[PDB]
């Protein structure tokens, strides 16, 4: 339909339109009954209690998508070319992009082959030149995402401050990324946003943490997501070694936003900072949530 478009950008850069307007132009269409495609799989936890079981929390699980495509052409040689190109568009080690475009925008999922594809019918595929490939792909990162929102604040003063507007319009908490120039001592916000995960929801409402004093040439990236180390210098200096066990603890909870403050001190040149706010969603399409 014209309300939904599904595309695949392979690991080699090939572009396919499985469903939607212009689907099947490259020879591959999407068969029905695709699973674990819409909602992010989450399992909830329960402890024994006096009234049965008590809620203990939730964990989001990786997506195990199983879907069939149909590769077709008029002649078997061109069908063989199409099938080979489709196979080349996938890999186990590196992930290809799967984009869904609706009136809510375009959200992409990074997927890799979980196991070998299951191609063709019972007979040889050159008889038909129109054969299905069943594919079991997996999303290690299970959330659908959009292009992150980026803001830049530069200054020439030795000491300065700024406000970054931030707002999570998605379904799930997002983890902020910072890029900070050197030299200079930065103070970055780590607001709880009312999140009570550490039982400090309103104690950490205005939490600010000071990064270690960066030496010349030691521009740092401070990624708060748990997949990656928090502090990483671009010159290879061990910055987090000088941070005494400090860390950024809180994601940007959904529906929360404010003018988070960034402070720069002891910057003789006057540095710059960049804030990246990811746009993660648990669904290929969803109306914005206030």
């Amino acid at each position: 339909t014209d309300f939904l478009k599904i595309e695949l950008i392979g690991r080699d850069g090939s572009h396919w339109v499985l469903s939607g307007p212009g689907m099947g132009q490259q020879g591959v269409t999407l068969n029905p009954n695709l699973q674990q495609f819409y909602d992010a799989p989450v399992k909830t936890l329960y402890v024994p209690g006096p009234f049965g079981e008590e809620y203990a929390g939730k964990r989001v699980q990786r997506r195990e998508i199983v879907f069939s495509v149909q590769a077709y052409d008029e002649d078997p040689d061109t069908w063989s070319t199409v099938d080979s190109l489709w196979r080349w568009a996938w890999d186990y080690d590196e992930e290809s992009e799967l984009r869904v475009s609706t009136s809510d925008g375009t959200r992409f999922l990074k997927v890799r082959l979980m196991e070998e594809p299951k191609p063709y019918y019972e007979k040889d595929p050159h008889i038909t030149a129109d054969n299905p490939i069943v594919m079991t792909v997996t999303a290690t990162f299970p959330y659908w995402q959009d292009e992150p929102e980026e803001l830049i604040w530069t200054t020439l003063s030795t000491e300065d401050m700024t406000r970054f507007p931030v707002r999570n319009d998605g379904d799930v908490p997002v983890w902020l990324k910072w890029t900070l120039t050197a030299p200079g001592l930065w103070i970055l916000p780590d607001f709880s946003w009312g999140n009570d995960m550490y039982s400090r929801g309103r104690e950490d409402l205005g939490r600010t943490v000071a990064m270690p004093e960066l030496v010349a040439g030691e521009h740092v990236s401070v990624d708060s997501d748990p997949r990656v180390q928090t502090l990483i210098a671009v010159n290879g200096m061990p910055t987090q070694n000088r941070w005494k066990g400090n860390d950024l603890l809180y994601p940007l909870m959904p529906g929360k936003g404010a003018e988070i403050p960034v402070q720069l001190k002891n910057a003789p040149e006057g540095g710059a900072c960049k804030l990246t706010r990811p746009r993660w969603y648990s669904r290929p399409w969803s109306r914005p949530g206030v």
Binding site: P21, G22, Q25, G27, D73, D75, D77, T78, T81, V82
Partner: protein, 311 residues
């Protein structure tokens, strides 16, 4: 799809074959002045080939010599463009060219190192056996003589019920030109016995060593083959006596091209020839034996035969 696109197709290429696109599959309405060109490109964007098609009023024809399309590899991209008069070119077909031809994985299949081979025969069974292929006289022209009246091993020779001269060829072929044939033979009568080396599969041309044993022959010759049962002598000959259980080693050496014969344990050649005009190499590595007796009784015949590849 607001804007139409090309059609994905394929083009078949074959080594030594003319690349042709027939006009009946590129039919259309092409006014005079319409052009068409086919571009073959690699994965980096470099043009591997460019050809111009013969555009007529109702078809476009492509025809190229194999040398033009030799260098386009398997999997190269292709685009076909048609330019109408006073109009921009448009692409009708695009895709990848496949090469539909026998593919040679080995750069050079050198002659495999067929190692040295050895064979032996003793003739103790009732019949000759399938390892000897009769020649000239046809099937059933060989047999085994017991020689029980002299207390000797059985020997192979023509079945003198209906034949007097006959030849046999070893079933398998040697792997090298140089060979050694060790035969233990008896002289229980009068006749001629040929050891055949470097023969064809029909034993038409070969080298050979002939032992003639008779009341006056008592001689050894070097012979060249013309037919399984006919031969021509080369050079002179050496007088020789053949006792019962006499072992003769016939060695053919490819390098230092020569044929030689040794009696018993002596390394001195009793007879030797060099430079004989017989084809060698592949297909001419068969060995054999032949017998020719004026009478219908066994003459000089082998009780033991042995072949080794190489000298």
């Amino acid at each position: 799809m607001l804007s139409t696109g090309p059609i994905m197709e394929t083009l078949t290429l074959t080594v030594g074959s003319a690349f042709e696109i027939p006009g009946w599959k590129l039919r259309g309405e092409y006014p005079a002045g319409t052009t068409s060109h086919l571009v073959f490109t690699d994965a980096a964007g470099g043009t591997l080939g460019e050809f111009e098609g013969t555009v007529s009023a109702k078809e476009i024809h492509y025809l190229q010599a194999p040398d033009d399309v030799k260098n386009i590899p398997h999997g190269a991209n292709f685009q076909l463009f048609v330019t109408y008069p006073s109009m921009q070119p448009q692409c009708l077909y695009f895709g990848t060219a496949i090469r539909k031809e026998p593919r040679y994985p080995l750069s050079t299949v050198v002659s495999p190192e067929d190692s040295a081979v050895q064979y032996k025969a003793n003739f103790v069974g009732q019949y000759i056996g399938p390892m000897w292929k009769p020649m000239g006289n046809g099937w059933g022209s060989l047999g085994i003589h017991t020689h029980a009246l002299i207390s000797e091993a059985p020997s192979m020779g023509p079945n003198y019920s209906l034949f007097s001269s006959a030849a046999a060829r070893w079933l398998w072929s040697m792997n090298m030109d140089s060979v050694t044939i060790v035969v233990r033979v008896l002289n229980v009568g009068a006749g001629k016995f040929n050891v055949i080396v470097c023969a064809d599969y029909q034993m038409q041309t070969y080298l050979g060593i002939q032992f003639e044993t008779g009341i006056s022959n008592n001689k050894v010759h070097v012979i060249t083959g013309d037919g399984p049962l006919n031969w021509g002598y080369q050079g002179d000959a050496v007088n020789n006596t053949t006792a019962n259980g006499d072992v003769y080693t016939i060695k053919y050496n490819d390098l230092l091209d020569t044929i030689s014969c040794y009696k018993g344990t002596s390394l001195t050649p009793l007879i030797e020839a060099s430079g004989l005009d017989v084809p060698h190499g592949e297909g001419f590595r068969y060995t054999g034996l032949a017998w020719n007796t004026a009478l219908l009784s066994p003459g000089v015949e082998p009780t033991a035969w042995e072949a080794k590849d190489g000298v």
